[PDB]
C-alpha cells in the first residue's frame, strides 16, 4: 500500500539549516506531487510548498519561498525539504503528503493530498543537556477548597523531558497535582508541581519538594516555606 | 485567500456534527477535508466537497455552496473525536490553503469549568534576575482552553508559553501557562493578569509585585 517514509526527530540550534526527508513505496515516486505541511505545537496545518518528482518543479509557499528548498532524488524515490535560518517558530512537525487526488476539472487543476507520511518533528534549542533551577511557589488559600493551601515548585530551563517530583521523599501523595512540562520558545522545558495541604499545617508540618533531573544528573530538595 | 474555521465543536453522543468552512466564493473551489484523530496522522474523509474516499463511514458527507463547505457527521460516536481541516487550491496565487481547524469534541460528561491557581515570582527567581508568573489550569472539561495575559490593562503577548491540555485521573483536563519577564518589568506595573476563556466564559486572577 502506498506509504510515506519520513525521517526522524532533529534538534537544532538556532540560525542552522536541517534536512528532513520523505521516501515513498507503494507506488511509483514520479506519478505525483510531494507536499509539505507543518504544524507547531497546538496550532493549525500550514502549507509550505510541493515538488512534482518527474520534472523536479516546484511550487513554494510566499511564507517559506526562499529560505526553505524542496529537492528530490528519484533513485531512491525520496524528497527532501531543507530549512534554513531556523529559529523558534520553526519548532514543529513537518510532514510530507502525496498529491494523489487528479483533478476531475481542468477549472480546478490541482491535485489534492490523500495520503500523509506521519511527519518529522524539529526542536530549536540550545540542545544541550541542561539542569533545572527550582524556586518555591509560596502557600496560598485563594483558590482552593476552604480550609486548605496550596503551594509548589517551579522546576525551570531543563533539557530534556523528564523531571520527576515528589513531595515529602514520596510520604506526601494526596493532593499532588505535576502539570505536564511546556517546551518553551528558548527550546528549554519547564513545569509546575503543587500540592494542596490544609491550612492549619503550614506554621507546623515542613514541605519539600524532591525534584529529579536524570539526564543532568541534578537532584533538589526545595524547602517550601509560608 | 482566508478559509475561516470554528476552533471547536461540541456534540453529544448520536447527534448531527456539521463544521463549517468559509470562504469567499468557495462554492467555485472544490472543497477537501481532513481528519487528524489525536496524535495519528491527517486522513482525508471528504474529497471533492461530497465524495467519500473507500474506508470512511457514510456517516461522513460533505456539502458546498456559494460561500461556506461543510462538514456533517450524522450520529456521531466517541471514535470521531479528531481535529477536522478543509482546503482548497488558490489559482490566483498557487496557494494550497488550509483552514484553522476545528476541534470536535464528542460529550461523554457534563461541561466542567476551569479552576485557575496565578502564582507570582518568588523572591529567589527575582534574586537570580528572572521573572515567571506561573498560571495554573484544573478540571475542565472540554478540553479546549484559551489563555490572555494582561500587564496592568494592557495584552501582553512576549515571553506566554502555555500547554496544551492533558487529561487528568478525573477524565477532566488541565493546562498550563507561562509569562516570563525581567524584574524590572515585573517591578514596574501595577499588577498583570491571566486571563482563562472556556467556552465562552472567562476567569481571571491578578497578582501584584506589592
Known amino acids: 500500500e502506498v506509504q510515506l517514509v519520513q525521517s526522524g526527530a532533529e534538534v537544532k540550534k538556532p540560525g542552522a539549516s536541517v534536512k528532513v526527508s520523505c521516501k515513498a513505496s507503494?507506488?511509483?515516486?514520479?506519478?505525483?506531487?510531494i507536499n509539505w505541511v507543518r504544524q507547531a505545537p497546538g496550532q493549525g496545518l500550514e502549507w509550505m510548498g510541493w515538488?512534482?518528482?518527474?520534472?523536479?518543479?516546484?511550487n513554494y509557499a510566499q511564507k517559506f519561498q526562499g529560505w526553505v528548498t524542496m529537492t528530490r532524488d528519484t533513485a531512491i524515490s525520496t524528497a527532501y525539504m531543507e530549512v534554513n535560518g531556523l529559529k523558534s517558530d520553526d519548532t514543529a512537525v513537518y510532514y510530507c503528503?502525496?498529491?494523489?487526488?487528479?483533478?476531475?476539472?481542468?477549472?480546478?487543476?490541482?491535485?489534492?493530498?490523500?495520503?500523509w507520511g506521519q511527519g518529522t518533528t524539529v526542536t530549536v534549542s540550545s540542545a544541550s543537556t541542561k539542569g533545572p533551577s527550582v524556586f518555591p511557589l509560596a502557600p496560598s488559600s485563594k483558590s482552593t477548597s476552604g480550609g486548605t493551601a496550596a503551594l509548589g515548585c517551579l522546576v525551570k530551563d531543563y533539557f530534556p523531558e523528564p523531571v520527576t517530583v515528589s513531595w515529602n521523599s514520596g510520604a506526601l501523595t494526596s493532593g499532588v497535582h505535576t502539570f505536564p512540562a511546556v517546551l518553551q520558545s528558548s527550546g528549554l522545558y519547564s513545569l509546575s508541581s503543587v500540592v494542596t495541604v490544609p491550612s492549619s499545617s503550614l506554621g507546623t508540618q515542613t514541605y519539600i519538594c524532591n525534584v529529579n533531573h536524570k539526564p543532568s544528573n541534578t537532584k533538589v530538595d526545595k524547602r517550601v516555606e509560608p | 485567500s482566508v478559509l475561516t474555521q470554528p476552533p471547536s465543536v461540541s456534540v453529544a453522543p448520536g447527534q448531527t456534527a456539521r463544521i463549517t468552512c468559509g470562504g469567499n466564493d468557495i462554492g467555485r473551489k472544490s472543497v477537501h477535508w481532513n481528519q487528524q484523530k489525536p496524535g495519528q496522522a491527517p486522513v482525508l474523509v471528504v474529497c471533492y466537497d461530497s465524495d467519500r474516499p473507500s474506508g470512511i463511514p457514510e456517516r461522513f458527507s460533505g456539502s458546498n455552496s456559494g460561500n461556506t463547505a461543510t462538514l456533517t457527521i450524522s450520529r456521531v460516536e466517541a471514535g470521531d473525536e479528531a481535529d477536522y481541516y478543509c482546503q482548497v487550491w488558490d489559482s490566483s496565487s498557487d496557494h494550497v490553503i488550509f483552514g484553522g481547524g476545528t476541534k470536535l469534541t464528542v460529550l461523554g460528561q457534563p461541561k466542567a469549568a476551569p479552576s485557575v491557581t496565578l502564582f507570582p515570582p518568588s523572591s529567589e527567581e527575582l534574586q537570580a534576575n528572572k521573572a515567571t508568573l506561573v498560571c495554573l489550569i484544573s478540571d475542565f472539561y472540554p478540553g479546549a482552553v484559551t489563555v490572555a495575559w494582561k500587564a496592568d490593562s494592557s495584552p501582553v503577548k512576549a515571553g506566554v508559553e502555555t500547554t496544551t491540555p492533558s487529561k487528568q485521573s478525573n477524565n477532566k483536563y488541565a493546562a498550563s501557562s507561562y509569562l516570563s519577564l525581567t524584574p524590572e518589568q515585573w517591578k514596574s506595573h501595577r499588577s498583570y493578569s491571566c486571563q482563562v476563556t472556556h467556552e465562552g466564559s472567562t476567569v481571571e486572577k491578578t497578582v501584584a509585585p506589592t
Open positions: 503528503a502525496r498529491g494523489g487526488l487528479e483533478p476531475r476539472s481542468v477549472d480546478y487543476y490541482y491535485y489534492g493530498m490523500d495520503v
Open positions: 507503494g507506488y511509483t515516486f514520479t506519478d505525483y506531487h
Open positions: 515538488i512534482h518528482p518527474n520534472s523536479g518543479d516546484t
